[PDB]
């Protein structure tokens, strides 16, 4: 049993866009933009929708860069997160009720205030490598097990 999620990182040559989640799941942490995939939309449609809802941004093209599966102890559904990246965006990021966006220089990524798994796979993202990851969480702070490998096809 799994549920589809999206995560979108706007990565430009010297900077990456992150949003500070202000309520709900993962509140109080920086992350890319995204969320649940709905019935009746493709995964990529969902990524675009969440990007627009959370930042006002639209994009020309989204590129598949990763897939990460999360298990939370005691929770029946696995989280199947499809991770996308893009360089060219359309518009200027604006704050939503969900997210407060900011640009970060690539050597100033706030890992201590991000999901812990990001510390493991974000470098691969910045190095433009495609990846498959798995992280087992107890609660929201503790990684119990994980696997991470580069792949050819996401
Ligand atoms: C559990 N560690 C997570 C979860 C997550 N999510 C973003 C998309 O919605 C599903 C949860 N994003 C990151 N970077 N790490």
From Swiss-Prot:
Coiled-coil segments: none
Primary enzyme class: hydrolase
Binding annotation for 8-oxo-dGMP: 6, 21, 31, 115-118
Cofactor(s) required for function per UniProt: Mg(2+)
Binding residues for 2-oxo-dATP: 6, 31, 33-36, 115-118
Pfam families, per the entry: NUDIX (PF00293)
Residues binding 8-oxo-dGTP, per UniProt: 6, 21, 31, 33-36, 115-118
Activity regulation details: Inhibited by 2-oxo-dADP and 8-oxo-dGDP.
Binding residues annotated for O(6)-methyl-dGMP, in chain numbering: 6, 21, 31, 115-118
Reaction equation(s) it catalyzes: 2-oxo-dATP + H2O = 2-oxo-dAMP + diphosphate + H(+); 2-oxo-ATP + H2O = 2-oxo-AMP + diphosphate + H(+); 8-oxo-dGTP + H2O = 8-oxo-dGMP + diphosphate + H(+); 8-oxo-dATP + H2O = 8-oxo-dAMP + diphosphate + H(+)
Assigned GO CC terms: cytoplasm; cytosol; mitochondrial matrix; mitochondrion; nucleus
Function summary: Oxidized purine nucleoside triphosphate hydrolase which is a prominent sanitizer of the oxidized nucleotide pool. Catalyzes the hydrolysis of 2-oxo-dATP (2-hydroxy-dATP) into 2-oxo-dAMP. Also has a significant hydrolase activity toward 2-oxo-ATP, 8-oxo-dGTP and 8-oxo-dATP. Through the hydrolysis of oxidized purine nucleoside triphosphates, prevents their incorporation into DNA and the subsequent transversions A:T to C:G and G:C to T:A. Also catalyzes the hydrolysis of methylated purine nucleoside triphosphate preventing their integration into DNA.
UniProt subunit comment: Monomer.
UniProt protein name: Oxidized purine nucleoside triphosphate hydrolase
Designated gene of the protein: NUDT1
